[PDB]
C-alpha cells in the first residue's frame, strides 16, 4: 500500500528506527505524527550508527523528505542539538527535514515543571523521560501555548511567552517551590533560531493530500510504543500522545481513509522503562539475560530496561487498536542460547478467572497473573540470518505459534541492529 | 460501508444530531468519539423536538445501541440531567447506552477553572461554552485527571480526588483569586451516581472490534466541527480534541483502517459562536436573516451565532482532512426568498496575493479577505421537499457548483428540521 504506517506493539523501543530507515528505500516522505524528543532510536549501517530522537529515521536518506508533523510537541533546542550532529557527520538536515507550524514549542519551562510534578508524585512517579513532554502537551490542549507559527511575529511572540513565563513561575515558585525559569533566556534561546525552524516550514496536511494524489510512497513513523497511548494504555503510567494509529491521521492531516498497511514492530521478547504494569515481567537470570544481549538501554534516558516474556495477551491489543495489517519481528537473535521460550497467551485475573482480554487502566492490572506456554529455544545463532532456511526449526515454531495467536502474518523478521541483517517477506508497499 | 463517520464541515452547528438520528435506523451501534457536553443539538421528529448534548443522536431508536467513548470528556452531573429528561419522556436511556471506564471525568474545579481562565483572557477570551471542557482536557494529558474506571475504588477515588482538588484550590485562590471548589460537595455529588456511570461500562474497543469481524452497520457522530479542531483549527479559537475524523480512532479504540465512509455535514451558508477568524461573516441584513430563518442560537448556551456565506475554501480544507466520500447539504431552505447567493471560492491574503488554500493558525487569518462567485437565489419555497424534481434549477446549480469546486458529490440533502424533511441520493451504508 502507498501509505504505510510502522509503529511500536509493546511499550517503545522494539526496533521502529531500524526499520523506517530499512523501509523508506522507496519513500518520497517519512513522518513523525506525535510524541518528541522522549523518543530515542539507534539505526546502524555498516557498523556505523546514528542515534535520532526527534528527527524521522528517514533523514539519513536522500531520495527522502523527512516531515515532523502538527502531533508532535517540538523542542528549538533539541532539533538544533541534533541537526548540528547530523550535518557535522554529512547529512544536510535542514535541506531535507520539514515541519509544521501547528507543531507546539517545548520549552524550559516545560522541563522545569516536568521535573516539578514528577518530583511531587514521590514515590507514584511516573518514571517520565524528563523532557517536558507532558507540560507542553498541557499547554496545547489548554490553548495557551506556543506554536511553530507564532515565529512569524516575533513581537507577538514575546508578548504571549512573556504571559504564559508569567503563569507557569507562579506556580513553580509558589506551588511546588522550585525556581524560576528567566524569561529573557527563553526568549533569547529560541530568538536565535527562530529563523531556522521557520524556513522549515510547510503545509504539511495539504503535503500529504498532495502526495496521496499521485501515489507517492509515504510512511508513517511512530515513536514510543501502543501502551503508552494516552487514551489506551496503562494509564496513568503512560505518555501524553496517542502513540496508536489514531495518531497518524490527527498528527500529520491526512484523512484516516488513506492509510494503506500498519505494520507492527513486534520485539521477540519484552522490555519497559519506567513505572508501570508489566505481567511478564522477568526479574531472574533471564530477565538479566534478556537486558544483556539485548543491550538493554534506554536510548534517551540510558536507563535499564524491564525485561520479560512476548505477551500475547497484550500484543493482540495492539492488533485491534492500530488495525494491524502484519508483524515485524525483531530480535529474534538475542533469545539464541536458551533453552526454553515462553508466551503469555492469558491472563489470570486476582478473582480466578482467566481471561484473554487486557485491563485497561494501571490499576486494573494489580492482580494479573500470565499464564504462558513454554517452546524450546534453540541453539543455532539467528545472528545476521537473512533467508529463513538459516532459521532452526524451533525459531520457525516460535514465530508461527505468535501468528496462530494474533491473527497477523510477521512479514519482516530482523536477526541483528545493522538495516540489512534483516527477512522482508513481504514488503508492506506491494500491497 | 459498514463503519459511517458523520461529522462538521465548518464550526460544529450544521447538522449533525437530525443526521444521525435520520441514519441510525440501520445501525447497530452509535458513537461519540469526542467533545463533551459543550455539544447540543435539537432532532426534531413529527414536530416533538428533543435536545442532546452528551448522549448520541441514536438514542431515541430502539434498535441502536448508544456509546460515548474513551475520547469523550464526561461530565457525571451532565450524562444524569440528561439521562432523566429522556427517561421521563419514555426513552430508557440506562438500557440502551453505554460508556467507556477510560472517559475523563469533568467535574465542578474543572468548569471553576474554565472560568477563571476565561476571564483572566479579559478581551482576547476564547468564547467557550463554559463547560469545563478544556480543563478535563488538561488533567486528562497531565495524567492526573480522574476517569470512570476510577470509580472501582471508591476509597482510592476519593485519595486521588483530594490531592486533584489540592492542586487546583492552591491555583483558583491563590493565583486567580476565585472561590475554592469544596473537596467534600464534588466526591458527594459524584459517589452519589457512581454506581449509574460505572454499570453502563462496556469494553468500547474490543466490541467494535467485535462488531467489526460481524459486519455490523457502526456510525460514528462527532461534535462541534472540523475548523474546531485543536491540532488543525483556528488555533486558539478551537475546542480541545480532534473533532477531524483521526478522533475517531482515537476516542473510540477502533483501528482507523476500519472508517468505511465520511459523510461531512455541510451547512447551506455559515455560522460560529465564540471569538475565531470567519472571512465569510456577513454583518448585513442577510446576516440577520441568516441568524432569523435559521433560528441561530447554541443550543447549549443559547448564544447568537456569527452567520456568513458557505466557504468552499475552508470547506475544502474539511474535505482533504477528514478523507470526505460526501456531503449531506444542511438547512438548504433558510435561503429561500434570498435573491442572489454567494460561495467563496478563494482568499486574497494581506499582501496582494489569491489563494485556495487557509491559513493555519487565527492570527494567519487576519488579513485574509475572502472572493466570490454570485449565483441567484430563488422565489421557490424548499422546505421539508424530499425530491430533487422539486428543487428549483437554481437550487440545482447551486448544488452541481459546490459539488464542482470540491470534488465531493452531495449524498444527502436536508430541508427542514424533521427527520422526515430530507432527501438522500445515497446511504452512506449502501457502498
Ligand atoms: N540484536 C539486535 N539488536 C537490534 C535489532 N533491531 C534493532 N536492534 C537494536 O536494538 C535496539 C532497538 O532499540 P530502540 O532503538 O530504542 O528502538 P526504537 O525506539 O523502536 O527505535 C537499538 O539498540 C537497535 O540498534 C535486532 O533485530 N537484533
Ligand atoms: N430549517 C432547517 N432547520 C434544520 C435543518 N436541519 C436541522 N435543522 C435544525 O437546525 C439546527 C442545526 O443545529 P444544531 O442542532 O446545533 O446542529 P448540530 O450541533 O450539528 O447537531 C437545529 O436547530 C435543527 O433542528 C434543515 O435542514 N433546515
Ligand atoms: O520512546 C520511548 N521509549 C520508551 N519509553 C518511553 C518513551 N517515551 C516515553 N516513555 C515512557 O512513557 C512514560 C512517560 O514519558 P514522557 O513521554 O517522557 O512523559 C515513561 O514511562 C517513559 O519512560
Ligand atoms: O458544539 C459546539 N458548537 C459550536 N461551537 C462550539 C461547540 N463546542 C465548542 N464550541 C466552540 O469552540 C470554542 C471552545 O469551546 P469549549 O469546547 O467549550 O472549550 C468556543 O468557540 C465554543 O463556542
Ligand atoms: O528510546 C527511548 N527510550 O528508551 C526511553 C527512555 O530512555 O526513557
Ligand atoms: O451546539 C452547540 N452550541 O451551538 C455551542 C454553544 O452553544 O456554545
Ligand atoms: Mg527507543
Ligand atoms: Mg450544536
Not at 522494539?14 to 530499512?22: M, N
Not at 525559569?181 to 504539511?204: E, P
Not at 526454553?340 to 492482580?367: I, S
Amino acid at each position: 500500500g502507498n501509505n504505510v504506517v510502522v509503529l511500536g506493539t509493546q511499550w517503545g523501543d522494539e526496533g521502529k528506527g531500524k526499520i523506517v530507515d530499512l523501509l523508506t528505500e522507496r519513500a518520497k516522505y517519512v513522518v513523525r505524527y506525535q510524541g518528541g524528543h522522549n523518543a530515542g532510536h539507534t539505526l546502524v549501517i555498516n557498523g556505523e550508527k546514528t542515534v535520532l530522537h526527534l528527527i524521522p529515521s528517514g533523514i539519513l536518506r536522500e531520495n527522502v523528505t523527512s516531515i515532523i508533523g502538527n502531533g508532535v510537541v517540538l523542542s528549538p533546542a533539541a532539533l538544533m542539538k541534533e541537526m548540528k550532529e547530523l550535518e557535522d557527520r554529512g547529512i544536510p538536515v535542514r535541506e531535507r527535514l520539514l515541519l509544521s507550524e501547528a507543531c507546539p514549542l517545548i520549552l524550559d519551562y516545560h522541563v522545569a515543571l516536568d521535573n516539578a510534578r514528577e518530583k511531587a508524585r514521590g514515590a507514584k512517579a511516573i518514571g517520565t523521560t524528563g523532557r517536558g513532554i507532558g507540560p507542553a502537551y498541557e499547554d496545547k490542549v489548554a490553548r495557551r501555548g506556543l506554536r511553530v507559527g507564532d515565529l512569524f511575529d516575533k513581537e507577538t511572540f514575546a508578548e504571549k511567552l512573556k504571559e504564559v513565563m508569567e503563569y507557569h513561575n507562579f506556580q513553580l515558585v509558589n506551588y511546588y517551590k522550585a525556581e524560576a525559569v528567566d524569561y529573557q533566556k527563553v526568549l533569547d534561546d529560541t530568538m536565535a533560531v527562530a529563523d531556522i525552524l521557520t524556513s522549515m516550514v510547510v503545509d504539511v496536511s495539504d503535503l500529504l493530500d498532495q502526495a496521496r494524489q499521485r501515489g507517492d510512497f509515504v510512511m508513517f513513523e511512530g515513536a514510543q510504543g501502543t501502551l503508552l497511548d494516552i487514551d489506551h494504555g496503562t494509564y496513568p503510567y503512560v505518555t501524553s500522545s496517542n502513540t496508536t494509529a489514531g495518531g497518524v491521521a490527527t498528527g500529520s492531516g491526512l484523512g484516516p481513509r488513506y492509510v494503506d498497511y500498519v505494520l507492527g514492530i513486534l520485539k521477540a521478547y519484552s522490555t519497559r522503562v519506567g513505572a508501570g504494569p508489566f505481567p511478564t515481567e522477568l526479574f531472574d537470570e533471564t530477565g538479566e539475560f534478556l537486558c544483556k544481549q539485548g543491550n538493554e538501554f534506554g536510548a534517551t534516558t540510558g536507563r535499564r530496561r524491564r525485561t520479560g516474556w512476548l505477551d500475547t495477551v497484550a500484543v493482540r491489543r495492539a492488533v485491534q487498536l492500530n488495525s494491524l495489517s502484519g508483524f515485524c519481528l525483531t530480535k529474534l537473535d538475542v533469545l539464541d542460547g536458551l533453552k526454553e521460550v515462553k508466551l503469555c497467551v492469558a491472563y489470570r485475573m486476582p478473582d480466578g478467572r482467566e481471561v484473554t482480554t487486557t485491563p485497561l487502566a494501571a490499576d486494573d492490572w494489580k492482580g494479573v497473573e500470565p499464564i504462558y506456554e513454554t517452546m524450546p529455544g534453540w541453539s543455532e545463532s539467528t545472528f545476521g540470518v537473512k533467508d529463513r532456511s538459516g532459521l532452526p526449526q524451533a525459531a520457525l515454531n516460535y514465530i508461527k505459534r505468535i501468528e496462530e495467536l494474533t491473527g497477523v502474518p510477521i512479514d519482516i523478521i530482523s536477526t541483528g541492529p545493522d538495516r540489512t541483517e534483516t527477512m522482508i517477506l513481504r514488503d508492506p508497499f506491494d500491497a
